[PDB]
Amino acid sequence: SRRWFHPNITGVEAENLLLTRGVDGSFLARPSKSNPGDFTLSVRRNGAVTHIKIQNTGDYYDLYGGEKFATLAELVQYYMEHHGQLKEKNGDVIELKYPLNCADPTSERWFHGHLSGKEAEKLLTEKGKHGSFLVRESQSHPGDFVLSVRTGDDKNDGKSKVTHVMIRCQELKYDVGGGERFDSLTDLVEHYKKNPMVETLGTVLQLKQPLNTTRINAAEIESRVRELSKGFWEEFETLQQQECKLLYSRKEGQRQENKNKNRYKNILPFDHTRVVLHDGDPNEPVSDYINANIIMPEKSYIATQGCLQNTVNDFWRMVFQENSRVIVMTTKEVERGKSKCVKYWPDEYALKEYGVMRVRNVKESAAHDYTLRELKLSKVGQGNTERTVWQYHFRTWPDHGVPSDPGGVLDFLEEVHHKQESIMDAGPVVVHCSAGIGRTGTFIVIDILIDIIREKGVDCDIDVPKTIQMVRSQRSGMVQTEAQYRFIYMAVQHYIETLQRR
Numbered sequence: 001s002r003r004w005f006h007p008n009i010t011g012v013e014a015e016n017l018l019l020t021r022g023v024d025g026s027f028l029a030r031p032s033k034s035n036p037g038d039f040t041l042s043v044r045r046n047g048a049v050t051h052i053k054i055q056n057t058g059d060y061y062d063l064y065g066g067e068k069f070a071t072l073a074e075l076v077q078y079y080m081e082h083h084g085q086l087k088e089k090n091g092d093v094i095e096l097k098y099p100l101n102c103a104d105p106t107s108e109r110w111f112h113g114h115l116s117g118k119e120a121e122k123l124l125t126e127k128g129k130h131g132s133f134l135v136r137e138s139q140s141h142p143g144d145f146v147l148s149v150r151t152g153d154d155k156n157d158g159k160s161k162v163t164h165v166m167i168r169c170q171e172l173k174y175d176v177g178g179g180e181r182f183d184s185l186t187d188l189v190e191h192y193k194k195n196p197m198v199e200t201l202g203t204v205l206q207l208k209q210p211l212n213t214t215r216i217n218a219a220e221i222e223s224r225v226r227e228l229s230k231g232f233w234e235e236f237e238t239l240q241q242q243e244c245k246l247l248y249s250r251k252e253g254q255r256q257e258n259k260n261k262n263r264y265k266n267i268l269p270f271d272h273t274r275v276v277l278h279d280g281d282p283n284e285p286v287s288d289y290i291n292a293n294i295i296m297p298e299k300s301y302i303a304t305q306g307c308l309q310n311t312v313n314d315f316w317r318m319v320f321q322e323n324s325r326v327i328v329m330t331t332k333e334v335e336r337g338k339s340k341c342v343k344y345w346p347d348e349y350a351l352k353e354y355g356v357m358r359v360r361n362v363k364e365s366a367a368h369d370y371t372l373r374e375l376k377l378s379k380v381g382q383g384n385t386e387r388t389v390w391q392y393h394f395r396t397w398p399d400h401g402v403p404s405d406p407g408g409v410l411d412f413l414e415e416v417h418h419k420q421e422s423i424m425d426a427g428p429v430v431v432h433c434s435a436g437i438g439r440t441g442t443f444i445v446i447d448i449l450i451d452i453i454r455e456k457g458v459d460c461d462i463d464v465p466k467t468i469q470m471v472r473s474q475r476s477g478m479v480q481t482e483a484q485y486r487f488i489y490m491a492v493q494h495y496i497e498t499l500q501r502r
């Protein structure tokens with residue numbers, strides 16, 4: 001369902017699982033132990049298991065002998081609807097039919113593992129609300145679990161309370177002492193989230209939301225980073241597990257008429273946040289589509305792909321229409337010999353027409369990590385529509401992974417920030433890389449987080465994974481890898497330490 005990912009399995013456990021508990025068409029996904037960014041899709045077919053490698057270096061999930069995807073969930077959805085579409089090197093079809101579910105609860109937000117009832121009561125009392133709950137290992141009955149839930153009023157008078165429900169684990173099935181025996185804690189929790197338990201005297205044990213364990217005071221960032229450095233992996237895992245909630249429709253990008261406007265055919269903008277282009281060529285049957293989404297913190301952004309030859313004109317329609325005055329480009333045009341973005345700006349001192357739009361490149365300035373290009377955009381035939389668009393082109397991002405130090409990125413975003421804020425009623429900041437989800441998401445999330453610290457100073461609340469999940473609900477797969485997740489925390493930490501130095 002949303003449990004086909006096995007975070008702690010090994011290759012051999014995965015084979016035995018598929019062979020003992022699965023059938024032909026059964027599959028699961030799992031991480032490599034050794035090489036973060038590597039994943040395996042394990043699949044039973046013809047009474048044997050095939051392992052298909054998936055690689056992610058920061059831009060997308062690349063399935064060997066398949067396509068590129070924004071998220072593993074989107075990959076799984078695509079092949080569970082397209083059979084015969086995943087091919088072996090033989091050229092034979094590999095069918096994904098029957099997800100093989102994982103029982104491991106460590107990636108669930110509500111699971112806290114080693115925690116006493118006393119620390120649970122303190123956290124629910126401090127951080128918890130009516131319906132806030134967690135699951136923990138039992139102290140009194142080793143091997144069992146306990147569900148702890150706060151109920152009552154959110155307005156220490158005693159009309160709130162915490163109730164602890166024993167969960168028995170008996171032959172790898174879980175129960176609350178009567179009724180149904182569940183295959184996983186996840187199934188138990190989902191069941192009593194639907195069909196809540198009622199105490200003898202009426203209190204309904206509503207399981208509304210897990211306890212928040214990721215929010216920190218920005219001033220204590222150093223403690224959390226030290227703490228997460230011995231983990232980052234589990235926190236990222238918990239976040240990744242939540243991507244099964246985000247399979248929003250992308251129908252406009254899947255239209256025949258829009259196919260060749262996507263750099264990657266399965267990395268598409270969500271319908272609900274896509275940038276819609278108005279004023280199109282009346283001849284062009286579909287002229288309203290670009291692979292771009294509005295991103296609102298919840299200053300806005302447009303997250304988009306690097307231009308194709310045939311979408312350059314669309315890109316400039318978008319910039320013009322949305323009144324954007326700043327463009328952030330986080331890729332070189334070419335990396336590893338592959339075009340990542342076509343050159344959609346004119347050479348310095350030159351002027352080019354891109355369909356109905358004209359752009360002049362007034363001046364380039366080189367800095368250590370970036371080039372700034374001062375561009376003037378206007379509509380042909382209409383002189384008083386000219387506005388300056390500042391393209392900040394970050395040029396030193398490594399081909400794979402992330403930079404070792406966040407200083408160049410932070411200086412770059414500070415400059416982008418001051419430029420944006422200097423322009424009265426500027427539209428959203430446009431941000432793009434290649435596919436528009438990995439680097440792009442990383443730069444956007446860092447900018448959202450630093451902006452909070454900018455407004456509210458060092459004694460304010462930040463929550464990295466909730467920020468990422470919020471951005472991921474507006475464009476598929478924003479922030480691609482654990483290295484990018486760690487870099488975000490590194491970037492915030494550096495920003496905070498520099499304020500404290502003053």
Ligand SMILES: Nc1ccc2[nH]ccc2n1
Nearest residue numbers: 005072073107237240241
């Ligand atoms: N539970 C999940 C689901 C999808 C994922 N992609 C990378 C890690 C991961 N974990």
